[PDB]
Nucleic acid binder design. Structure first.
Ligand SMILES: [Ca+2]
Ligand SMILES: [Ca+2]
Ligand SMILES: [Ca+2]
Ligand code: NA
Length: 285
DNA sequence: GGGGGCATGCAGATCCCACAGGCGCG
DNA sequence: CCGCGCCTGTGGGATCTGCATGCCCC
């Protein structure tokens, strides 16, 4: 097939679903492997097939019977990833993992990792990447095992980025309690609270719910007023369209919202049509 | 000729998704 | 009374992330 993704839409999807990896396994020879991975359900397998088509790089492998992932692992292959994220930077705290990813690329590019000092520099880089060093790798190289990293406070660059972030970690659904209510919600780890609260001002609507800050690792940005949803959330994603099955979930979302606008959610066939839309909305296509 | 990186995966940990009920308020 | 929407709460899987190596080339 043939497809191409907007560069800013892709960065937003990377901020939500991407992952930068640096594995150092024993072979004192060491297996060092840089990677960038986006693993998704098979329902969204065409995104990864399309992102591979945009970057013209990467491999697609099966992960189980229901999941698929795009993994970029070759050295020359990783050059296109950095060139994309140098001009379209990541916004969430994952950008720090990319920064350490870029440093690791340069060390391997200069062939420094083939010596003892080069491996020591990368295990120090890996210490700050994602979940840090494992217990076995922390047995050696206890010099700089500090897993903490400078936090990343950044603002939303554009709505094209938001479409890719929403396509990842967002959700469009409809509640029936009978009464009809459309709800838009984005969840995220508490580490990007300042970025999540940016959406209140960036969108002019929505609320932030956290619960007990202790013993809960993630907050929620949610908008429930229909006026804010029909006027300030749906047009902004019609101009900057989403990707993956989230688009079709969003498509049927506005189809239901059009019925609520015409006040047609009182007829028996209106809710019967609304219920049929929901029956294949998120559990289905 | 062999050391390092490619090929192509498999396995673990958790951050999400897609909701739920209660209820004060206009 | 009706119905909207703030507010608190969540199971579990789709994510994020980690682990693995025989074999290829140069
Ligand atoms: Ca995410
Ligand atoms: Ca997702
Ligand atoms: Ca996600
Ligand atoms: Na959705």
């Amino acid at each position: 097939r043939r497809e191409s993704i907007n560069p800013w839409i892709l960065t937003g999807f990377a901020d939500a679903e991407g992952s930068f990896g640096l594995s150092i396994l024993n072979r004192a020879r060491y297996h060092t492997r840089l990677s960038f991975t986006i693993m998704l359900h098979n329902k969204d397998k065409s995104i990864l097939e399309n992102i591979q088509s945009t970057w013209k790089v990467g491999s697609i492998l099966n992960n189980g019977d229901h999941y698929v992932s795009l993994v970029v692992y070759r050295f020359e292959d990783l050059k296109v990833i950095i060139d994309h994220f140098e001009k379209y930077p990541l916004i969430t705290q994952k950008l720090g993992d990319y920064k350490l990813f870029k440093q690791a690329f340069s060390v391997m590019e200069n062939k420094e990792h083939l010596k003892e000092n080069g491996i020591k520099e990368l295990v120090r880089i890996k210490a700050k990447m994602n979940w840090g060093l494992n217990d076995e790798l922390k047995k050696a190289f206890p010099e700089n095992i500090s897993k903490e990293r400078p936090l990343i406070n950044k603002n939303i660059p554009n709505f094209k980025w938001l479409a890719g972030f929403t396509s990842g970690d967002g959700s469009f659904f409809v509640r029936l309690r009978v009464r009809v209510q459309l709800v838009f919600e984005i969840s995220q780890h508490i580490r990007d609270k300042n970025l999540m609260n940016s959406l209140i001002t960036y969108l002019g609507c929505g609320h932030i719910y956290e619960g007990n800050k202790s013993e809960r690792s993630w907050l929620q940005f949610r908008v429930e007023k229909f006026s804010d949803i029909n006027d300030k959330i749906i047009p902004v994603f019609q101009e900057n369209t989403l990707i993956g099955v989230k688009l079709e979930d969003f498509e049927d979302w506005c189809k239901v919202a059009k019925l609520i606008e015409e006040k047609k959610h009182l007829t028996e066939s209106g809710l019967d049509e609304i219920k049929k839309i929901k029956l294949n909305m998120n559990k289905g296509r």
